[PDB]
């Protein structure tokens, strides 16, 4: 268990239940004390959040090219924020807000983290990525960070093998139920969470 002390954690439109900034600070600390390191945010819908936090990250078929398959996160919560919501309305056309999740990996996996300036998920970058990770795609027990699109945010792709070794806990950053599709308000990011959101230093050169 990595959720800290308190009541049963659940995800809701009203926000993550039994999850205060203080409880996050405890969960984060106890994670580092066990050799885990924070690597970014993942925004998704409520049921997915329940699945990820209590069942763990599990490989699944996703709508892209096979060679880029993996678990996608973002160092900047603002980027992951945009994905923290329903992608499909129900019968009544209701689109709920999702939840921001914090993603942790064993520090033993850090040697497999690389960064690049090229745009990911594109054929022109596949070669450079395969160079850095020292093997053909897809990513395995390694990760790649780079602009999601030209001149845009940085995104991180955790190879599925690595993704399944993560520990994911809720963020203290709420989504807005009354502004679904809006952007992350910097003022709504708890200062004490920002203080524990520093990212590791990634390698720009092959191992």
């Amino acid at each position: 268990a990595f959720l800290g002390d308190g009541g049963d954690v659940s995800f809701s439109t009203r926000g993550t239940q039994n999850w205060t900034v203080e409880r996050l600070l405890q969960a984060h600390r106890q994670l580092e004390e066990r050799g885990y390191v924070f690597v970014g945010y993942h925004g998704t819908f409520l049921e997915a959040a329940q699945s990820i936090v209590f069942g763990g990250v599990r490989a699944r078929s996703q709508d892209l090219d096979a060679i880029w398959r993996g678990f996608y996160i973002a160092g900047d919560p603002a980027l992951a924020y945009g994905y923290a919501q329903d992608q499909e309305p129900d019968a009544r056309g209701r689109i709920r807000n999702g939840a921001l999740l914090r993603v942790y990996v064993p520090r033993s996996s850090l040697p497999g983290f690389y960064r690049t300036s090229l745009t990911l998920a594109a054929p022109e970058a596949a070669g450079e990525v395969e160079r850095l990770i020292g093997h053909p795609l897809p990513l395995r027990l390694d990760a790649i960070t780079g602009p999601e699109e030209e001149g845009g945010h940085l995104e991180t792709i955790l190879g599925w093998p690595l993704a399944e070794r993560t520990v994911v806990i809720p963020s203290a950053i709420p989504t807005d139920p009354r502004n679904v599709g809006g952007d992350l308000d910097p003022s709504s990011i708890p200062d004490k969470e920002q203080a524990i959101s520093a990212l590791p230093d990634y390698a720009s050169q092959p191992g």
Binding site: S12, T13, R14, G82, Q85, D86, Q87, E88, P89, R92, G93, R94, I95, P177, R178, N179, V180, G181, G182, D183
Partner: protein, 823 residues
């Protein structure tokens, strides 16, 4: 007594022998008790689908010489009595009127000791205003004997004062067009007894006894059994002098022949004088049976009394002999009950109770049934005959001969008898009878008028409204009881057409009502019957409306999450005339888009171009809010229409100000840009875009909030009318009119009262008028507050802030930039 459908019909045919009446009594004065005596004696049983008991059928049979005493046309010895159920507290004023309006007579119950209470007095006053004839029964005599141990003369004088009080109310408020309608014991219009023990009597019952053994027609005998008539026991002479020659006091006949026998039984039985009781019983010819012969104390007293003077008989006697039939009553009730010309063909048909003329059926209420969630229309035929299959004109409250507003020409599924909790289908039903109808609940909310003439006006309409102006959040204390609450809300919603249960976006279970009291009893019914589980209920909250009253300062723009779709729109106010038209079915969402456009253009000054481009109404797809498509040359525009409409349904249900519904908000879609590929413009992409653009556009059109306002109608004696104004002056009340009922000192005051000022209103009005006032309020209109809802210190803003905190929202109202595209 069990009857077949045939016998019932033959009984409803002779409408001269029908008695439509109700019981006017305080719950604490054994109202239900006396009612039980009646149903257990003359209750009509019938030799599947159940309903909520609204009316009871009673059968009474009398003699040829008993019928001869009836001063109205009669036909036979059989009599059908309709006992119309009535509310338990006067606070339910609207349904008190409904019951009285379909009745012609009234059994008024008063207490021996406490006499006539304030409530009973107020209700009786209303009954007389409906031109209803009263018969009185003085209840709880037992208390005067067992507890107070009064003397015979004391008890008599007590009755005299009681009868006096009643007649003061009667002579004051009874309509002069009815003649002397005061009650007199010597005439048989007053009964005495105790519902508790199940005994009661009239002077006529005792007159019948002594009529023989005094060689006197009971007419003269009962004239003596009340007032100053004295039978000297020593001389065996009748006198009007309360003293003999030697100046010794004489006992009045009432005390001697009526009270004495009763007092003697009470004394013998309650003092366990086993030697007297038998002799006393044989004397009055009261025969006991086996088990009963071993009883003693109250047990024996109850058995002896209720077989000596069965309560139900005394009551039925008065009802049949003195209460008017439909034929008699409608002759002077017609004008009052017809909102049209007095010499109209239909009004004349009601005066004559004409079974042949055009149908005039009055629907007083809708009754919950076991037949799914359907409601049966309960009411009364005043003219013509209702028939199964017969196509009728269903005229709603707002209907007027000429327009087709609030009109539905449908067919009656089945006409049924409402035998309390059960239902019996029948072919037809002549005028003068109470009846139920199947297949109307979807055209009538509660009250209405059924006709067959294309020139008939409505009958005196009872104002009602379904608008949920107050609501509460319902929550279970034990999380395991959740399912029981879900189904409880489901069935609470079915026991009343005016109750509303729904779920907010945040998942809260909401229960909304038409008033403070109405919502109160619904939550009591829910926690004890429909759910039965311990509930956590929030304080009552008033429902508000979010609106705009100017056009968006600038165009509202919003992007989809994937950044490929854009919606440009602008918000603007809708005229009140148009909003009212929409709420009144005039402008209809289900209407032909071209026929509707012609109406909005001709009658409401709309551009038929715009009116033909209405995409939807909202919320619930029928609210006073519109989406107008004003785009030009947009590819695939139609492929996102269902998503845009959906977004509007959610946007109008919970506005950006503080989560309240929108009203009178028109949204103009000026421009739209979409991605060529349909994969990147589905619901998940469009819905959020439209919602946020709508919010941005709303907040750019100087937002406002509207508050619900009641129309209050109060009856009150001139003396206490002052209190009405005293209470209104500190409730932001606004007097509409003050009228006085000609001849009587009864005033009707109408005024506007903000719903958020109506909490505990009846209590304060009660306090200030000594309970003389008779309140009656229905939702009238919405009122826009002048103050700025965005200002936390203003009246509107203060309301907003409190709500936002209560909902866990961010205190300050979001700026339009929040929903506008971030750039």
């Amino acid at each position: 007594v069990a009857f077949t459908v045939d016998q019932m019909r033959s009984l409803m045919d002779k409408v001269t022998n029908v008695r439509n009446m109700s019981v006017i009594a305080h719950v604490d004065h054994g109202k239900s008790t006396l009612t039980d005596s009646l149903v257990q004696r003359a209750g009509i049983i019938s030799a599947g689908i159940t309903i909520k008991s609204t009316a009871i059928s009673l059968y009474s049979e009398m003699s040829d010489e008993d019928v001869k005493e009836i001063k109205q046309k009669t036909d036979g010895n059989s009599f059908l009595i309709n006992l119309i159920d009535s509310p338990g507290h006067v606070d339910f004023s609207s349904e008190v009127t409904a019951a009285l309006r379909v009745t012609d007579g009234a059994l008024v119950v008063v207490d021996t000791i406490e006499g006539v209470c304030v409530q009973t007095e107020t209700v009786l006053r209303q009954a007389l205003g409906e031109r209803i004839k009263p018969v009185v029964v003085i209840n709880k005599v037992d208390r005067a004997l067992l507890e107070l141990q009064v003397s015979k003369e004391d008890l008599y004088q007590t009755f005299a004062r009681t009868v006096e009080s009643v007649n003061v109310i009667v002579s004051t408020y009874a309509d002069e067009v009815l003649g002397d309608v005061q009650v007199y014991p010597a005439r048989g219009t007053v009964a005495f007894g105790s519902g508790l023990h199940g005994w009661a009597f009239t002077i006529r019952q005792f007159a019948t006894r002594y009529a023989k053994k005094f060689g006197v027609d009971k007419a003269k005998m009962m004239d003596r059994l009340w007032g100053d008539s004295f039978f000297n026991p020593k001389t065996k002479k009748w006198t009007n002098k309360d003293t003999d020659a030697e100046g010794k006091p004489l006992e009045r006949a009432f005390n001697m022949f009526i009270l004495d026998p009763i007092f003697r039984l009470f004394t013998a039985i309650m003092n366990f004088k086993k030697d007297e009781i038998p002799v006393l019983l044989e004397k009055l010819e009261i025969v006991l049976k086996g088990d009963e012969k071993d009883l003693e104390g109250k047990a024996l007293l109850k058995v002896v009394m209720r077989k000596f003077l069965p309560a139900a008989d005394a009551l039925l006697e008065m009802i049949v002999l003195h209460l008017p039939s439909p034929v008699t009553a409608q002759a002077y009730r017609a004008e009052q009950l017809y909102e049209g010309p007095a010499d109209d063909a239909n009004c004349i048909a009601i005066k004559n109770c004409d079974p042949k003329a055009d149908l005039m059926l009055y629907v007083s209420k809708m009754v919950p049934t076991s037949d799914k969630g359907r409601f049966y229309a309960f009411g009364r035929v005043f003219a013509g005959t209702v028939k199964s299959g017969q196509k009728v004109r269903i005229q709603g409250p707002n209907y007027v001969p000429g327009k087709k507003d609030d009109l539905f020409i449908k067919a009656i599924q089945r006409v049924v008898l409402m035998m309390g909790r059960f239902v019996e289908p029948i072919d037809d039903c002549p005028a003068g009878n109470i009846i139920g109808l199947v297949g109307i609940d979807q055209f009538l909310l509660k009250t209405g008028t059924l006709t067959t003439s294309e020139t008939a006006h409505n009958m005196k309409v009872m104002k009602f409204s379904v608008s949920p102006v107050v609501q509460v959040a319902v929550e279970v204390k034990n999380a395991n009881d959740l399912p029981k609450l879900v189904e409880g809300l489901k069935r609470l919603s079915k026991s009343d057409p005016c109750v509303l249960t729904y779920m907010s976006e945040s998942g809260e279970h909401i229960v909304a009502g038409t008033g403070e009291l109405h919502l109160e009893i619904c939550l009591q019914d829910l926690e004890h019957d429909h759910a039965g589980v311990p509930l956590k209920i929030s304080p009552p909250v008033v429902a508000y409306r979010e609106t705009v009253e100017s056009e968006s300062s600038q165009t509202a723009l919003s992007k989809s999450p994937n950044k490929h779709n854009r919606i440009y729109l602008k918000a603007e106010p809708i005229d009140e005339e148009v909003s009212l038209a929409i709420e009144n079915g005039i402008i209809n969402p289900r209407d032909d888009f071209k026929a509707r456009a012609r109406i909005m253009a001709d009658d409401y000054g709309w551009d038929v171009t715009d009116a033909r481009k209405i995409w939807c109404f909202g919320p619930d797809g029928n609210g006073p809010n519109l989406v107008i498509d004003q785009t030009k040359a947009v590819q695939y525009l139609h492929e996102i229409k269902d998503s845009v409409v959906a977004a509007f349904q959610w946007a109008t249900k919970e506005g950006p100000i503080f989560g309240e519904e929108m009203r009178s908000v028109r949204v103009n879609i000026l421009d739209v840009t979409l991605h060529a590929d349909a994969i990147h413009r589905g619901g998940g992409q469009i819905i959020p875009t439209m919602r946020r653009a709508t919010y941005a556009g709303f907040l750019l059109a100087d937002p406002k909030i509207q508050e619900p306002v009641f129309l209050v109608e109060i009856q009150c004696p001139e003396q206490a009318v002052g209190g009405i104004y005293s209470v209104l002056n500190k409730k932001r009340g606004q007097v509409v009119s003050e009228e006085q009922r000609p001849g009587t000192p009864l005033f009707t005051v109408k005024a506007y009262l903000p719903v958020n000022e109506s909490f505990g209103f009846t209590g304060e009005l009660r306090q200030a008028t000594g309970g003389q006032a008779f309140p009656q309020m229905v939702f009238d209109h919405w009122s826009t507050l002048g103050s700025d809802p965005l200002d936390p210190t203003s009246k509107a803003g203060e309301i907003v802030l409190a709500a936002r905190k209560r909902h866990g929202m961010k205190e300050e109202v979001p700026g339009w930039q929040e929903y506008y595209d971030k750039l």
